[PDB]
Structures are given as C-alpha cells and as structure tokens.
Design an enzyme around this catalytic site. Sequence first.
Site: not given
Ligand SMILES: Nc1ncnc2c1ncn2[C@@H]1O[C@H](CSCCNC(=O)NCc2ccccc2)[C@@H](O)[C@H]1O
Lengths: 333, 333
Positions: A22, A114, A123
């Site tokens: 995205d 994010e 979520e």
């Molecule tokens: N309690 C929690 N403790 C620890 N981890 C937790 C918890 N709740 C959820 N999670 C993780 O949170 C992620 C959301 S998806 C990746 C978002 N970050 C991402 O893309 N970053 C890079 C990016 C690049 C450009 C623009 C935006 C972002 C998952 O991997 C979950 O496993």
Amino acid sequence: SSAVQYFQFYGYLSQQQNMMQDYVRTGTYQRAILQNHTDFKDKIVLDVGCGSGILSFFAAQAGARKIYAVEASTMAQHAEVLVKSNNLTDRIVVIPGKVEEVSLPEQVDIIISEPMGYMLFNERMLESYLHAKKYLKPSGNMFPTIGDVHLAPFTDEQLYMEQFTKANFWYQPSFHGVDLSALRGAAVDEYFRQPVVDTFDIRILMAKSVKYTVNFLEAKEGDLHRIEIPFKFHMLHSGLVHGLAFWFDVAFIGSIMTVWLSTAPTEPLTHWYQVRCLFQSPLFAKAGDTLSGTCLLIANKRQSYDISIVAQVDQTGSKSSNLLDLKNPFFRY
Amino acid sequence: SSAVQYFQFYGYLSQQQNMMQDYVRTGTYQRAILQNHTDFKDKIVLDVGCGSGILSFFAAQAGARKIYAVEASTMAQHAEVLVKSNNLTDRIVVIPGKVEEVSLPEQVDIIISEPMGYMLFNERMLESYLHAKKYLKPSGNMFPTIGDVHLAPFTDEQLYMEQFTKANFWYQPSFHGVDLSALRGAAVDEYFRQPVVDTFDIRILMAKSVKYTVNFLEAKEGDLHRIEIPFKFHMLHSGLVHGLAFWFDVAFIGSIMTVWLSTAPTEPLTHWYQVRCLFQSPLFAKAGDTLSGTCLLIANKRQSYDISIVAQVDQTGSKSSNLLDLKNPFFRY
Ligand SMILES: Nc1ncnc2c1ncn2[C@@H]1O[C@H](CSCCNC(=O)NCc2ccccc2)[C@@H](O)[C@H]1O
Ligand SMILES: Nc1ncnc2c1ncn2[C@@H]1O[C@H](CSCCNC(=O)NCc2ccccc2)[C@@H](O)[C@H]1O
Ligand code: NA
Ligand code: NA
C-alpha cells in the site's frame, strides 16, 4: 483463541508484504516521520507491533538514538534479520513479545505504530497502542497522534438489491426435490449483517460527514470497549438512504508539521478501502431533512466489533436499524 | 480454539450455499443414495454434520423411516426450518450438538456424511465420521464407504517460478531507504510451504498415480492422526519433477450399485479442486526411472495436517523434500 489466530496471521511474510504494497500507507508514514525529523533526532522511540520493522527504520533514518521494536508474532525474527543486514544493531533493538508483557529498560520520547483496522478500530490493536503509553515520558508524543472516524449517509440501490441476489440459491422451491425457500429470509438477513468493504463513487454520499475524534495522547485502553457515535445529518440530496458509509483519517502532529493519512473516498484508495453498513430497510429523505441516530461499536471476543446502527428521518419519523458483525465483512472490491 | 473458528464458519448460510453450488457434489450424493434406495427404505439413518440437512432429505426421498440429523453449528436451527417447511417432522429429527456428545435414542442402519476436505483429510471431520460408528449396527453401512487418496509426480516450471516472483517485494535492495533483500530466502521458503489448491492440465502428470485407501467401515478415529503413504512411481515422461499432485475419490458401496465421487483432474472440476505440494528443489527424471519416497500427514491442533514429503530418483540418487502446512494453502484458481 481469536488472539492466537491473530498473531499466527501476522507472522507470515506474505501478509506483511500485502500491507507494505500500500504506497499511500508507506509514503505517508515515511513523510510524517521524516518531515518531523527534529522530533526523532537523538530521541528514544518505541515501535508497537513493528512487523517487518520498517517504521523503526524510518525512525533510524530521522536520527533516533535508540528504537525498541516490539513484535509478538514470529515476524520479530524477520525484523531482527533486517536490522542486522541494514547495519542498525547499534540503534534498533527488537523485543519479541506482547507490549503488555515485555520489559523496556527505559521510558521513550515517542511511540510509533500502525494499529488501524477497517473502520479504524477493527482488530482492537489501538488498545495495545494506548496500553504502551505506560512507557511514554510525560513530555512524549505518539505517531499517529489522533484518529477521526467519518460516517455519512449513502444511497445505492445496486448494493441493496445485491443482498437479495446473493441469496438466490435459497429462493429455489424445488432443488433436487427439496424446497429451500423457507430459508430465503434468514439468508438475506445474514448478508445485510455483513459490513461491505469496497470503494464507491462519492456521489452516493447524501450529506457532509459527521466526525468522531479519538485523541491517542488522552484516550485510555478501556475507552475503546464501547464507542457511541451520535449523528445528525443535514441532507443535501433527495432519495433512499440505504445505510451509513465509514472511513477514517489519522494525523501525525509533529513540531514541524501535521501529516494526514486519509482513507476518505475523495482520496487515493488504500488497503482499508471504505466500509458500508446497510439499514435493514431504506429511508426516504429529501434535501433539507435531518437524519438522526446513533452508531454504537461494542468490542467482542473475536478481536472485532458488533455495530449497532439506528436512524430516523426527523421530518417523517421513518426509522430503521441494523446489527452487524465486523468479524464477517463482505469484501466486494 | 481452532474448533470454535471451525463451527462459527459452518454456521453461515453463505458457506453452506457455497458448498451446495457444487453440482458434482450434490448430484453424486443424490445418485448414490437414490440408486441404492432399497438400502434406505424403512431404515434408520444418522447424518453426521448435516449442515442444511440436504443429505437427510435425500435419505427421506429414498423412504428412510427415521433420520437423525446431527449438527454442532448454528446451522442446526436452519435445518430444522427446512424439515418443518418440507413437512418431514415425522421422519427427520435434528439433534443440535457434536456427534461425540449427543444422545441418540437408538442404533442406526446407515451413516451418511460429507466429511471430506482438501486432500480428503483436511479439517479432520473424518475423525467425527468414524467416531459416529458407535451408533452403527454391526450389519450397518456408511455412505461414503471408502476413500482413495491419489498422488502423482508433476512437472510445472511456471508454478515453481511463481514462488520466486511472488516474493519480488523482498528482493528490493532500496525500498524507502531500507534493503529488504536479506528476507528474500525466507519469503520464497514460506511460499514453497503452501500447498497449492487449483486445477491443472493432466499432461503435467509424469506417472500413473499411487492409491492409498481408507475403508471407513474398518478405520478407527485414531488411524487418521498419522497417515504414512509410501510411493514408487514408474516414470512415463522425461523432465523436471517439481512436486506431487494429490486428489481423492470416495465410493458409496450400496447393495444395488457402487457410485464414485471423483476429484481427479480427468473428471469435472469440484470445489475440492486438486492440491499440489512442491519439493524444495526439482528432480530430473527420465522415462523408465523410478521416483520413490514417502508422503507423511501428521494431524495438528489447527484442524489440519503438516505434510512431510521426501522423494529420490532411484537411478541417480537425486533427492528433495518439503514440509508444508495444509492450514495455509495458496488458492491459485
Ligand atoms: N499487543 C501487541 N504486542 C506486540 N505486537 C503486537 C501487538 N498487537 C499487535 N501486534 C503486532 O502488530 C502488527 C500489526 S501489522 C504490522 C504493522 N506495522 C508495520 O507494517 N510496520 C511497517 C510500516 C511501514 C509503512 C507504513 C506503516 C507501517 C502485527 O505484526 C502484530 O503481530
Ligand atoms: N463432530 C461434529 N458434530 C456435529 N457436527 C459436526 C461435527 N464436525 C463437523 N460438523 C458439521 O459438519 C458440517 C460440514 S459442512 C456440511 C456438510 N453437509 C452438507 O452439506 N450436507 C448436504 C449435502 C448435499 C449434497 C451433497 C453433500 C452434502 C458443518 O456444518 C459442521 O458444523
Ligand atoms: Na429484516
Ligand atoms: Na530451500
């Protein structure tokens, strides 16, 4: 149990790749951090749910002295590979585990994440984002800083009619010797209770949006268990109102500038699309009427929300309602 | 927890409709029951996991005296509506609950079910089907009666190459200032571990299939926890072997005739499609060589199977292997 499924899902590089493709999401986060580089330079950062780690790399690009990258899924092992291969082991520390359970050795200047799902809250990750403020210094900031949920009445008889067409199987009075037609009502009702994830032409919107703001610097984790959004729309168009359309913006409020990430249907499409919730029956409104009611979001045990909508045309008393499950969306795009 | 997700999924009329729109599935079950109507007439039937109830209606069409329709999901309430609307409350009794926990008031003459998943065993419902034999009279029958799993070596460099192309995101040495390339290996490895659900041209098959038969009249529930399928293929074609292709047949062995439901790639397509598992690296075989090895299926806690494949070309000693998760299939159709 829903939580096990959630962390298993995000442990796949294929899912992280999907989100990272995205270009509005990637470009807007990078711009928010780097235009505000003076807010990050020589600071301590916490990245909540770091996934691939790319926000931690953006914080490092802005000159952050130390970034704690917290990740509960098996993705933590992949983020650590990128930190080593990008020669950033002096400044980025990957901490495997839940932000609710891990130990940080120090308080941080700024939290980045994010945590946004469909309709902002899906979520329930914003609860972990707000929880993480236990590590934030009183002078500290959060990126994103605020979230705005927008909702607007829409007119779309094609979407309304589809709910009946999708159930055409159950209309059959003679299928291999069985009359299925007694279930047509139940099948149509089930389709009406699925929020619709897709985009649409802005001309289906019949009034200016109502805005509900969550200030992540002020909000408590428990605030997001029950979200009640009253509305009164000043109708600009005449026709049948089939339901409510939803989108969200987040703002990154830095010292140098405020950067917005918008998922509005006036802005370039994102992987969040927009969400539509039908009423059980459409309401006729003329331009100048008011449509009043409430959207109530109640957090559930499937890391999602039950959505209760009620609306009335004030001038006629015509009313409808629905109760939808954001765990079972219809991906119509 | 996986079991909660499983029963929630099957409680939706939309999912039951999806399965019921497979005309090979519907037509073959109806033909199996009704060509063998003398096996059902005046008999007692158990329908395990009845869903909509349509197999119970087919048993009633064949003149069964009493049908117990057991269903654990909220679909039980919808089946009861169809029984009332089709005027069959004297002959079909819907019992809500798990076949492992409910009380039947009597033993049955014949068990009917659709317990088959991808590669026959996926979703582990055959264990509940076999469990239900506690209610079967010694003289009793089961429809389906036997299951045949087929596997054959395939050649398809387009499918092999795609696994690399799908990971192209991770190949980027300069993505918004980050080198992603250290994760290309891990991303490609993840794609190789996804069984591929799609159909294919029968000319990719390089040998006659090996057959593994499960006799549901004889098999015990515990037999399906670990399924070991040795193979020796007599190669008919020369080229690179990229992996193994899988499909299954079930037979309904009645007094009047045996009816087959085949998901082979020589037969009309079904919602089961076929399944392909890549080796980690392809093996060159010439016509006349033998390809020997083992396919091991180990049941897991996500209602699915871990798939271990090992193969060698006997004449060269060239060997490869893979370990796949049938919980995370690639739907390529
Ligand atoms: N309690 C929690 N403790 C620890 N981890 C937790 C918890 N709740 C959820 N999670 C993780 O949170 C992620 C959301 S998806 C990746 C978002 N970050 C991402 O893309 N970053 C890079 C990016 C690049 C450009 C623009 C935006 C972002 C998952 O991997 C979950 O496993
Ligand atoms: N232990 C269990 N106890 C009780 N119910 C259980 C258990 N394990 C699984 N289930 C249910 O089994 C169904 C499999 S899906 C519907 C298949 N039956 C169906 O379409 N019949 C009609 C039909 C028509 C034509 C051709 C074939 C079939 C789900 O509803 C599960 O909730
Ligand atoms: Na209704
Ligand atoms: Na490999």
